Amino acid sequence: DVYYRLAKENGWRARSAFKLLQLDKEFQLFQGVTRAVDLCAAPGSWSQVLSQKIGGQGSGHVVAVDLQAMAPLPGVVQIQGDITQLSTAKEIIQHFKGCPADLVVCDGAPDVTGLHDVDEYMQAQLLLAALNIATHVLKPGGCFVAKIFRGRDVTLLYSQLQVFFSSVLCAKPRSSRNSSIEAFAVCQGYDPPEGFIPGPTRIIVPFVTCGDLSSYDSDRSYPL
Amino acid sequence: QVAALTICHQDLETLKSFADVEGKNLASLLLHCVQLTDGVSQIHYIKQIVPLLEKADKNGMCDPTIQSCLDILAGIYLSLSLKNPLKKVLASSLNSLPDFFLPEAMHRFTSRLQEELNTTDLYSYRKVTDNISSCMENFNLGRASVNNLLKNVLHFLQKSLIEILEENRKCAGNHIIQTQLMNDLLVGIRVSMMLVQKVQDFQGNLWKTSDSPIWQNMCGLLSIFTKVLSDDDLLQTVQSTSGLAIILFIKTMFHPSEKIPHLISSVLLRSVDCTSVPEWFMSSCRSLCCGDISQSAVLFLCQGTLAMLDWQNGSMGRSGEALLLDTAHVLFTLSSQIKEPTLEMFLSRILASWTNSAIQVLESSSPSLTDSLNGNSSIVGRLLEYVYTHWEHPLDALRHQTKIMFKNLLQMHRLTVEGADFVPDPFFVELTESLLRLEWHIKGKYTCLGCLVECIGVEHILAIDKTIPSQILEVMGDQSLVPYASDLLETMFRNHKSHLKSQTAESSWIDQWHETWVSPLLFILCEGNLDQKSYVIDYYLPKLLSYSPESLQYMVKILQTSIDAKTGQESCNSRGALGALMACLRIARAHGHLQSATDTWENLVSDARIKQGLIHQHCQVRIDTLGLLCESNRSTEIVSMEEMQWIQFFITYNLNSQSPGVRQQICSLLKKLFCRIQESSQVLYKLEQSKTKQHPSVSLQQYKNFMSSICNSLFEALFPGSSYSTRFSALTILGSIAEVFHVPEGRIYTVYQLSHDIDVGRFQTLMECFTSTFEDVKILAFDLLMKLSKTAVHFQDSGKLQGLFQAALELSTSTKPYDCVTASYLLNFLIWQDALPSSLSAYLTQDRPAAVVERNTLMVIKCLMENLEEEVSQAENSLLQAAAAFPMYGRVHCITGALQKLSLNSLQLVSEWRPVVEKLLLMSYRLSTVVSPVIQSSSPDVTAQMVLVCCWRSMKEVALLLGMLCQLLPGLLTVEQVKEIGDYFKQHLLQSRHRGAFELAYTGFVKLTEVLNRCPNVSLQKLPEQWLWSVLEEIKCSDPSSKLCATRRSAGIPFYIQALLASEPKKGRMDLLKITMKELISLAGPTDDIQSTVPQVHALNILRALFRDTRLGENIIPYVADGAKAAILGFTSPVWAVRNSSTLLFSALITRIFGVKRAKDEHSKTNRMTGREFFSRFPELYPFLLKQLETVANTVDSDHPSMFLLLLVLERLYASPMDGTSSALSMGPFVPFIMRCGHSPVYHSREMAARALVPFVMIDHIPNTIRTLLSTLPSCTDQCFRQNHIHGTLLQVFHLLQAYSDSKHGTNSDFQHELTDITVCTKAKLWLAKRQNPCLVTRAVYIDILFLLTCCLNRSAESLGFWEEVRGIISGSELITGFPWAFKVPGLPQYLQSLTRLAIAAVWAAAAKVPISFSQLLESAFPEVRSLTLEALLEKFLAAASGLGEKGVPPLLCNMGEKFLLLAMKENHPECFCKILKILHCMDPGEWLPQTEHCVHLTPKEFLIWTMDIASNERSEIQSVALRLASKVISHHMQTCVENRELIAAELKQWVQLVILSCEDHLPTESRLAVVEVLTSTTPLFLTNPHPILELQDTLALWKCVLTLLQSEEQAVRDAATETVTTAMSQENTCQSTEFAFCQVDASIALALALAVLCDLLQQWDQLAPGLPILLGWLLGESDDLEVNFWAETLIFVKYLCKHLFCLLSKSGWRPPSPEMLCHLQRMVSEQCHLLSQFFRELPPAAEFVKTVEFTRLRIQEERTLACLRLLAFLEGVLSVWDSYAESRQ
Ligand SMILES: Nc1ncnc2c1ncn2[C@@H]1O[C@H](CSCC[C@H](N)C(=O)O)[C@@H](O)[C@H]1O
Ligand SMILES: [Mg+2]
Ligand SMILES: [Zn+2]
């Protein structure tokens, strides 16, 4: 490919940066974003893109979190920890009392093994954690970008994501390897349920945590 | 090479006392022989020895001189090793001694052998045993001697074996000594068996008395054999040979011979009565009696039983037959217990041997044995079970043995049913039918079918199904199935030919044969896909042509016709005919078949056809034509002039091939051609000196000219900026020339010498090939330069070589990361040709060219080391400038590269090499200490990135240097130094904490570890095991505070363990592995201690690596099951880390068990194995899995479960179709639990359970299973509804129905009744699809079931009731009503898609004979409903309009133009807008364009403007679709009326600008594909129009687009552009520009052909005057005027354009009228020449190496400007600028 070179040639810590930029020019992610959250940034390339495209104004605030350590950037605050753990979730949400983030990105992935079912399982777990963080932070009508692994069965993930967002789109930028099954779910228009706090919730939350339909079940014949 | 004969010193006087100066006696001949060195004339004198003895047959008493002569001969013979052919020479010579001299030679050679037998040195035993071995084979001198010394030789063998065993048990610890001792044991045992088998003394009893010394020695030998068999620390070869020997001795030594089969039987059954065996047997074979022998012992004993007993002729009788059956029983018992891999291989061999013995017995057996050995017996059933279980074993030997067993089973059955009436036996027919049920990816199917074909004949298999040959050919596009398919097909047609030449005896049979085997082959060759063509040509076609060469005449006549009919049409079958003909002709010529005819035929090939093939678009056709020209059967056949011209034509264009395989094939064929030239030139020279043909001197001159011109072409191909493939090909072919014509240098005549054609400049270019960015090119250039003669300083003066050395020194310290590679190659070149400066002699203190290269290496290494020491000190001072100015890794890389070329084992200046190695190690450690803290931690006009590059590159270089130095065989390397190196590798690779120094240190450590294994010093070869133990006990008490990191899949510990385990000898002993796996499996097991998590984590991290390493491979199988258990049991652990590690390990285990994926997507059944194979290989998983499954099932109802992994395993097991016996482990019990797992509250688990249930249900049982599954669903009036349960049941029935439909589709006719029952059952519970069901997911799945049922019913023709129910479902749906509540209810989009699919199906059903209409589906507010409807409409339109297929649009879609026209303006969803535009493009513009005026209020012109606006703004697939639509509209406007050409002018200009825009990057590949397709469709209008509509600038812009896409980096665009060029050359007014009209050509020649056509048109339009300035602007390359490309060279375009411009101007004499127009070109060209001279002036010396990129771009610009000057000067005859630039440059 060519973007592995361009990552080293330019001031990008990894090739993955070019995946974010190519998702702007096709979805206009950085319309009016002022504060954004970056999940699972290994070297910080996505954090770098966000800082250069939002923090260039000066007031842009960016929070990056990963399982590993990162080289610090001007205008980005780094957190090391497992976003699956509740403590990391709490300290992340600690940064967003009052003003909520306009954009939440998640680039995480497990150690991709090659057979795709286990990758979907692990990615589903990571996406559930990321979605929890999002719903707990970003402002309604906001944006949530998340890496997914498009395998044979992707309807469930789309169904779950559609509940929380007005628009859900699946995109594969030019920088993504054509042999790889990775893709990106871009979620436009955060539209949380009316009775949802971080009626409708009793049906949605069980279905989003897992494909749990044990809310339409009944002990008497259904009304007509 | 031979070994010089030697003699005993004290024998000299003994042979001198009988020698004579005259030399009459044999003694003088011995003197002459011994005092020699050549082992050739000695052999001659050895022959003449016999006549000397023969000439004295009168004395009557042996002469004492002859006595001493023969004694010395015997002594020499006994002192000769078996590796010396002279030993066999004098053996053969003394075999022919005269009969008079035999007794004295007997006695005296006996004495010599006897005194030889009394040796007592332990390590001299092997020589004595070898001597005894030699005295047995065809050597009558020694046979009588050993026959006279049985007692002594037996005593020697016994004592030697005992002593070797003692020494081996005493030398424990050193494995080289142990290996030698085992080999000595093995030769001793084999010699003993030889003696017992091959001595005419053991016959009769004659020695069985207890007092005989022979008997006692034999008993002692038997005891030793038993003791060594029962032993287990020896090589398995020794034990197996011991078992053979035991059986042989028992057979020999047992007096009541008829009781031998019974006794042995008992020994095998462990049921021998200690009170009935003879006393000697109990004394010697106590282990065999009284029980307690290993399983290996019984295995090897039954092996020996089969091998060493007489099974033929029925000597052993009924007891022999009983022994055969008992051995079979014992072998089958052992099969289930043996689990060691090597023991499994041994068991396979023994089972095959059992089948052989059964064959031999069965040829004269009793009728009772016939019943027990026929094909329906239990024994043969078990054997077939073994074969079916084992044909796909990973070990190759296993599979080969299974093939042998299967063939022998069939032979056994044939022998048992010899009383046969009609040929097809029921057993064979049943076996064939069962085999034909397997899929075509099962590799054992092919071999088993081949054996069956040879058993029953292929006519019956063809009668069963006569499409089998086609079915086999269809899989031939998949490599790794090609060999099996080819072999099966070859067996099939050989048998068929033998069958047709049977009773029907005429000549017409061949016709039938042809139509069975050749016609499908021709169809594949002409019309198959590319991979299928290549594989059929490479593997299958040669077999068919070789078997029946007379079929070639048949094929050619068929193909030639199809060629000629092509010229009639000016079809695919007529298009692929040329390639097939070339393939057939190449195969025929290379095999010498009837086509061997002096320029390949008189008329099969013409000049036009060969030129078309050589340049064809398909790589295969080019390769086959080149092979037809290049390779011939006769290796010295003359190369004709025609072939030379064709080869030059080929070389001109085929040097830039992109496929590495294609390029390699081209280079190999050219090398074959050069070999033919070399070998026939010798024949020509011989005829010339021997004072129709053409006077061979003429042919020699032609050869010289041809080779010189080929070299000219190859060296032209090395222009600046040339591609990687062209440099690769040029250097490869040049090296091949240098190698091939370097043969006759010991000879007298050579037709060509590459060295003569090497100028100074060609040498400069070859050295400059060292600057290429690809290492392959560097290597090829280096090899070629080394192959040349008189090159070192002949081509170079001292000053310029000193400049080269300075350049290499400067490149070794540059910040660019890859300059050090160039510096290393330059330095190696200077070293290996003694071209170093003289000052470098000042570094060392003082022909064998090895010595001088070693001295040069030493000097350069010392210089590099001095520089490195200084730089490392300054880096210690401050690392910033070290990373900025002098990174230290370049010198380390150069040092390692210099050392790599030496033979480190054979140095000669150790006094000089010791201190240098010490200093080297010290500096390595210093540098590593300097740069490592930066690499574990973060950063400490110099960016941090380049600091990190310096640091990790230094790490890598130091690791590689240490790995190199480890190969000095520690001497120059002391043991302390090796220990320190190992400690260095351990400190890294376990404390790195970062990705760096994990894979960095691994390679060096692997090198060191392999060396440590091979080392003979004992203190060193114990290091790996000690290190392994140290790290294991480090792992147990991990203490998470340690430096070890969990991320990056582990703290490099897997790499450490892998490297240590790599030391183990390949397949040798593998004892470290057993310890490591025991400890790791124990650690990974469940732990009560909470703190014990970390030892459990690392284990699963290590185990994962161990289960994917290729070296451990088949040695790791006996642990898979255990590891599997761990992973599964680790999936339920509360801790997250344990579960994640379990997941990764389980992935590795799945890959190890089921294999690598065979195809990209489908994975139909390519990675599944039957239950029988899986549970035979891992029998301890059947209970476990079953138990575990039950557990999670019981958790579902009573509520991170491990259901996922269990189901994922279970989905990859299916039932064997050819299950001759019922499933022994009976996967059936799994079904009830799998179903219950479908009630999980987790969506993924329900889906996985549905998927996994499919393999566990028989196809004929799917209807009943579906009915009983549906019956569990709640009726509408029920009171208990659980949504998860309903969803799981629905998923199960959906997947079951889908599996059912994909079979029994056209195969059966009875499934109509079952489908009726299924649809009745579904109709019984349709209520779940209507609106009473509150959740949409369940509705969606039920509607999917209904839709699948509709698809089944449509192709299978009650149905009326089903259809009206479906209509009722659709009518009441929200698709019509709409969704009332505005809440995002789960499953809504999936529900809408299911409804839309069902609704569209209903609409099609109604039309073909209505709840909703296409019109009102397209108006729905939901974008996905519209998208699905548009997709259905689009596929209909495409299938009806574009891919006509003699079809039209269905009557329901006739007048939709207005609707889509309105939708296009209304739509806002891009994904639907693209489909709308595609549909519009699919319809005829003449039917919807007139309606544009009122439908959307747009005239056609402004509609066109609208489409172009869209195409100009968007940047996705819609861009390409809009461009296609705009082009179609323009084409319509132009083709309707002649008045449009004036009212579309501005639109035409805008369209041209749009095409130019879409040709560029930052757009998808589809945009460029669309541009090419558009241009192809409108060539006769915008490209080759006799009267252009556009202006000249626009026409040339379109042509420039064509030419620039034809050099695209991506293959599809290039192929499409070549199709455009073919259309351009095939037009009516351009059929004469080239000679390749109506031919599809490769892109390389497509560029030249396109330029030719364009120039011809420019002349034809008579608009040359304003055309030339534009083309010259192209030549100058207005882009620059001051990521690498793998295909496009600028100078290729420049060269072709310039050449065609010259040809045009010469044939035209155009002579520009007005100089002022070209004055601007002269101005700009002179300015460029001035700037280029200025730039070349200010460029440092040796800039070819120091400034490669700038130098290369300057050279390309210079070539452009020189071409333009050449053209301008030709036109003006300003050459003053030409002369000034030539003087400035040259
Ligand atoms: N459970 C988890 N919590 C936090 N980060 C995780 C995680 N699982 C995986 N990751 C992170 O997922 C990333 C995988 S690749 C990340 C690429 C990075 N975003 C870039 O810009 O290039 C790694 O950073 C890994 O640490
Ligand atoms: Mg590194
Ligand atoms: Zn006993």
Numbering used by the authors:
A (entry chain B): 10 to 207, 227 to 252
B (entry chain A): 10 to 579, 587 to 707, 717 to 871, 879 to 972, 1043 to 1072, 1082 to 1310, 1317 to 1474, 1482 to 1533, ...
Structure paper excerpt:
Thereafter, we incubated FTSJ1-THADA with human tRNAPhe transcripts and S-adenosyl homocysteine (SAH), followed by cryo-EM analysis. THADA forms a hollow cylindrical structure with FTSJ1 bound to the top, which completely fits the closed form of FTSJ1-THADA. Notably, the substrate tRNAPhe was located inside THADA, anchoring the anticodon loop to the methyltransferase center of FTSJ1. The interior of THADA and the tRNA binding site of FTSJ1 are strongly positively charged, facilitating the binding of the substrate tRNAPhe. The tRNA-bound FTSJ1-THADA was exclusively observed in the closed form, suggesting that THADA was stabilized in this state after tRNA binding. SAH bound to the active site of FTSJ1 via hydrogen bonds with four residues (Ser25, Ser54, Asp75, and Asp91) and several hydrophobic interactions. The THADA-binding site of FTSJ1 (Cys238-Tyr250) interacted with α62 helix and the loop between α62 and α63 of THADA, forming several hydrogen bonds, including Cys238-Pro1358, Gly239-Arg1363, Asp240-Asn1401, Ser249-Cys1393, Tyr250-Gln1400, and Tyr250-Gln1449, alongside a π–π stacking interaction of Tyr250-Phe1398. Notably, Glu1225 mutation caused a modest decrease in the methyltransferase activity of FTSJ1-THADA (lane 8), whereas other mutations in Gln680, Thr798, and Tyr843 in THADA cylindrical core and Arg199 in N-terminal tail-like domain almost completely abolished methyltransferase activity (lane 4-7).
FTSJ1 is a bifunctional protein that forms a complex with THADA (also called Trm732 in yeast) or WDR6 (also called Trm734 in yeast) to mediate Nm32 or Nm34 formation, respectively. Herein, using cryo-electron microscopy, we solve the high-resolution structure of FTSJ1-THADA with or without a tRNA substrate.
